[PDB]
Design a protein around this motif. Structure first.
Motif, short mmCIF file in Angstrom:
data_model
loop_
_atom_site.label_atom_id
_atom_site.label_comp_id
_atom_site.label_asym_id
_atom_site.label_seq_id
_atom_site.Cartn_x
_atom_site.Cartn_y
_atom_site.Cartn_z
N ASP A 161 0.81 -1.19 0.01
CA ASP A 161 0.13 -0.02 0.02
C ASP A 161 0.85 1.19 -0.08
N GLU A 212 -6.34 9.77 -6.88
CA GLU A 212 -4.76 9.29 -6.71
C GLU A 212 -5.01 8.07 -5.67
N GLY A 213 -4.38 6.92 -6.07
CA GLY A 213 -4.54 5.70 -5.31
C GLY A 213 -4.47 4.43 -6.20
N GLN A 247 -7.53 11.74 0.41
CA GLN A 247 -6.87 11.08 -1.02
C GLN A 247 -7.17 12.51 -2.12
N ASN A 297 -6.31 2.21 -0.12
CA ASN A 297 -6.62 3.63 -0.89
C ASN A 297 -7.08 3.51 -1.89
N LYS A 298 -8.22 2.52 -2.07
CA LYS A 298 -9.04 2.34 -3.16
C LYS A 298 -9.42 3.62 -3.84
N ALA A 299 -9.42 3.74 -5.33
CA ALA A 299 -9.95 5.10 -6.03
C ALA A 299 -11.09 4.50 -6.93
#
Lengths: 235, 49, 146, 472
Positions: free
Chosen positions: A39, A129-130, A100, A58-60
């Motif tokens: 991650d 971003e991620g 984020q 940190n899903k986008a």
């Protein structure tokens, strides 16, 4: 499809075990990678997070449609609304943690910077971003683009850490990660619904069935990991 | 008149009244606020409410 | 003798100790907290090492063996060359953070007792981790092979 | 909406632009050193990991700091600007002259704890109202005597200046008295319950907010992971509060009204009538406890059991015994179903084996386990009558339904010591006064286990069938 074997430098032979070769070529440099705290640090954890099809931390969110964006933001939150270009239903992404930041683009020219309002969006594009979620990509874009996205991400991880692995190894493993279907409407086949069937058997079965070929079996792809996909074996 | 002259001002000008009348709010949503000019109409219906 | 020490080192270290003094003055004046302070000290004694290594690159001749074995691509790098003729610089605590007190001495000059004490932390962390690392890699490989 | 305000706003916007520029550059060089350390780093794996993590923490801190960097500003009596924020920014060139203070500094303190009667050395205090990177507006708060201040969002300064009263003792120069009262409220050391009953025209709300700021700074170490719950009568007032609320640095508020104390539903002040005044009272607890016992209904007609040989074993004696024992453990209703079933099954198996199976002539190894087991099991699976029977006697129920099955029946009501002015047609026209009765009920009824297990099971096999079902 494979290509030239890197040992012999010529075309690969028949009977050559190329899955073990890829396994080993990816394992060997594993000690040269950042790891977890014994991650954010995208090393072996990220590789394990991809080959196992896990939802990232940190899903986008990505664009289910093309078109332009209307960007609103309030205290500690972003809300994007994608007005499409065809003229249909706009979608929304509302509870976007301002932590984020956004998807900076840094276009070739003009110094784009951040993603803004009135800017354009292709399908499968990333807004934050991620790290996108493979299953989203799968349903929106499709299987091939899933595979390509996964290879891109893995090889990004490696490259950033000085390891040279030709993408055909990543591709072998990925291929085996998207190698099955969940059946939905059996059709006229010897198949049950909710079952996992290998896509080649499935094609050959719903293809050899030509007699009364007016309603064959229906199936949807599924994105598995390298440990489930080893449980979902045919032997 | 009150409204459109207060528009000529630069301060909040909310009006209060019973629920039946339109265009005026009750006195229970101004519970803990302040305004610049205030107009209350029908003191007695709200007194006896 | 072949191990050569840059002469500019002293100017560098004192120029940076000036800024460290300034920081600590702020700290004692209340314009700075006890963590932001360490962050600034680290960001200061991380540049001194860069400058010392640069000087070392610009002062060592090319007929030198310690620069030849490096630039030939045979083995090593210039971070070790700095650690040896320059300055080990900063070191981690057993947690994994930094220590704003750097190591302004090389293994040629000779580390003091404390310097040699706070440099054992990361060393033992490495000798410990270097089996868990192997195990993680092997787990990933076992999966990929299955 | 003057012009000097525009001048000042533009100046401050320029300064914050400079700050954000430096922040952008530090993120830039930090990502650069990060990429570098990631590729080679030259040194050892542990040094590499340490540097990687450190630069990642820097990246994260700056990324977060992008959202409302500068809270505000201080002008001292010696005319030295100070700029407060969630990040310390210094100039490495002029001996680290603070360009932006961290609010956690011993030098950014006269921004949470400074008043107009006990300031520290200050002449003014500004707050800036940001969205994510832009300074919409600001408000001055002069720590002394004002004459006219361009923008305050509460106009306190121009009112504190137009104080025309007869000369004399004059309540000790009206302004000073107000300032000292406020100071007493704010700089007070009780860290418990304070009441600020005042009246209209005295700014009690702003004072309370300054008080909360003082407390959340002083004791920012017990708090800062708990929050600040601010209830109010209306969301208009709550947005007003949120709009003139001081920093609360690295903490977060939670706004509410009487009506949204419950997770999920937002009553729009239906305001059940004056008889509900018996709901805003603690006697009602009894009613609840008495309305949660009328749900342990006792069997009048004996329930038929059909375990292939056995006669109906449960009846007023059995149900009475079990309800008494279940009330005889001191814990909620939906967790007490456990003892009810334990007792009914105990007395329907141990007291049905030695009667209906065959009878006597075995005192061990058949009575103790075998018929024991068979009867137990045949009963535990009867999800048709046995379990429907229990759900008829000891219903697993929820707060959202008791108020409804009580406010209408007019008999369950009478069986609760309850009066009759609380009866209404619809049992789910939930009002403000029956919200705290729903939060009190989740603690009398609690939460079972069996149902939750079965439910999450089904949910698991529903999220596993949609994608692919091989879970084992």
């Amino acid at each position: 499809c494979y290509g030239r074997s890197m040992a012999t430098g010529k075309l690969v032979d028949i009977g050559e075990a190329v899955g073990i070769v890829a396994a080993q070529s990816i394992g060997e440099p594993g000690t040269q990678l950042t790891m977890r705290t014994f991650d954010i640090v995208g090393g072996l954890p990220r590789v394990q997070e991809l080959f196992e099809a896990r939802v990232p931390r940190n899903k986008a969110p990505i664009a289910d449609v093309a078109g332009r964006v209307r960007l609103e933001e309030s205290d500690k939150f972003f809300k994007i609304t994608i007005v499409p270009d065809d003229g249909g239903e706009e979608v929304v992404y509302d509870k976007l943690s301002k932590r984020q930041r956004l998807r900076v683009i840094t276009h070739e020219d003009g110094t784009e910077g951040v993603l803004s309002d009135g800017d354009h969006v292709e399908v499968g594009d990333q807004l934050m971003e991620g790290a996108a979620d493979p299953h989203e990509v799968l349903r929106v874009q499709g299987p091939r683009e899933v595979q390509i996205h996964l290879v891109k991400e893995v090889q990004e991880v490696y490259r950033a850490q000085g390891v040279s692995i030709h993408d055909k190894h990543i591709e072998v493993i990925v291929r085996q990660m998207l190698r099955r279907v969940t059946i939905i409407d059996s059709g006229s086949t010897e198949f049950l619904p909710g079952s996992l069937t290998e896509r080649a058997e499935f094609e050959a079965e719903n293809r050899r069935v030509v007699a009364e070929g007016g309603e064959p079996a229906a199936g949807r792809p599924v994105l598995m990991g390298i440990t489930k996909a080893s449980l979902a074996t045919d032997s | 008149e009150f409204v459109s002259e207060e528009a000529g001002r630069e301060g909040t000008s909310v009006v209060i009244g019973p629920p039946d009348v339109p265009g005026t709010v009750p006195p229970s949503e101004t519970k803990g606020l302040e305004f610049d000019a205030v107009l209350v109409v029908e003191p007695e219906r709200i007194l006896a409410d | 003798a072949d191990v050569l020490v840059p002469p500019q080192k002293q100017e560098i270290l004192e120029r940076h100790e000036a800024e460290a003094d300034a920081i600590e003055r702020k700290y004692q004046r209340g314009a700075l907290n006890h963590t932001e302070r360490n962050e600034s000290l680290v960001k200061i004694w991380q540049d001194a090492t860069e400058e010392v290594g640069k000087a070392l690159e610009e002062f060592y001749p090319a007929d030198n063996p310690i620069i030849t074995i490096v630039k030939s691509g045979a083995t090593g790098n210039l971070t070790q060359t700095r650690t040896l003729a320059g300055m080990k610089g900063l070191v981690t605590n057993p947690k994994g953070e930094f220590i704003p007190r750097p190591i302004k001495s090389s293994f040629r000059e000779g580390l003091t007792v404390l310097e040699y004490f706070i440099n054992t932390h990361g060393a033992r962390k490495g000798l410990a981790d270097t089996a868990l690392r192997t195990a993680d890699s092997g787990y990933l490989t076992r999966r990929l092979v299955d | 909406s003057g012009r000097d305000y525009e001048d000042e706003l533009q100046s401050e916007r320029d300064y914050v632009a400079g700050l954000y520029a430096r922040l952008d550059a530090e993120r830039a060089q930090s990502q650069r050193r990060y990429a570098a350390a990631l590729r080679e780093h030259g040194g050892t794996a542990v040094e590499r990991d340490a540097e990687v993590r450190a630069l990642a923490k820097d990246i994260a801190r700056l990324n977060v700091a992008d959202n409302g960097l500068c809270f505000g500003r201080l002008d001292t009596l010696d005319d030295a600007r100070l700029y407060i924020g969630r990040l310390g920014i210094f100039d490495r060139d002029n001996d680290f002259e603070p360009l932006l203070l961290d609010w956690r500094a011993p030098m950014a303190r006269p921004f949470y704890v400074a008043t107009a009667a006990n300031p520290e050395n200050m002449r003014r205090r500004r707050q800036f109202h940001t969205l994510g990177r832009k300074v919409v507006d600001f408000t001055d708060e002069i720590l002394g005597r004002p004459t006219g201040a361009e923008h305050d969002a509460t106009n306190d300064a121009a009112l504190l200046a137009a104080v025309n009263a007869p000369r004399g003792e004059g309540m000790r120069d009206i302004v000073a008295t107000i300032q000292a009262e406020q100071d007493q409220v704010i700089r007070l050391d009780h860290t418990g319950v304070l009441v600020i009953e005042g009246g209209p025209g005295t700014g009690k709300t702003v004072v309370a907010l300054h008080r909360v700021a003082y407390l959340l700074y002083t004791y920012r170490k017990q708090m800062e992971r708990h929050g600040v719950l601010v209830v109010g009568p209306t969301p208009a007032f709550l947005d007003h509060i949120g709009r003139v609320l001081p920093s609360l640095g690295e903490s977060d508020a939670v706004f509410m009204t009487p009506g949204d104390f419950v997770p999920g539903l937002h009553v729009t002040a239906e305001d059940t009538p004056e008889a509900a005044e018996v709901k805003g009272s603690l006697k009602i607890l009894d009613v609840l406890k008495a309305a949660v016992a009328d749900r342990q209904e006792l069997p009048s007609e004996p329930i038929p059991i059909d375990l292939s040989d056995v006669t109906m074993r449960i009846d007023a004696e059995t149900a009475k015994w079990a309800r008494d024992e279940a009330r005889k453990t001191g814990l909620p209703h939906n967790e007490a179903r456990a003892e009810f079933v334990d007792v009914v099954t105990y007395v329907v198996t141990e007291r049905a084996v030695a009667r209906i199976g065959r009878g006597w002539l075995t005192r061990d190894d058949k009575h103790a386990w075998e018929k024991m087991r068979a009867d137990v099991v045949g009963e535990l699976e009867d999800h048709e009558q046995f379990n429907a029977a229990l759900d008829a006697l000891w219903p697993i129920l929820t707060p959202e339904d008791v108020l409804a099955q009580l406010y209408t029946s007019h008999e369950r009501l009478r069986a609760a010591g309850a009066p009759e002015c609380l009866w209404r047609a619809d049992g789910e026209a939930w009002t403000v006064s029956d919200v705290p009765l729903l939060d009190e009920l989740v603690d009398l009824l609690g939460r079972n286990k069996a149902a939750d297990e079965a439910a999450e099971r089904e949910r698991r096999e529903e999220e596993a069938y949609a994608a692919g079902v091989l879970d084992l």
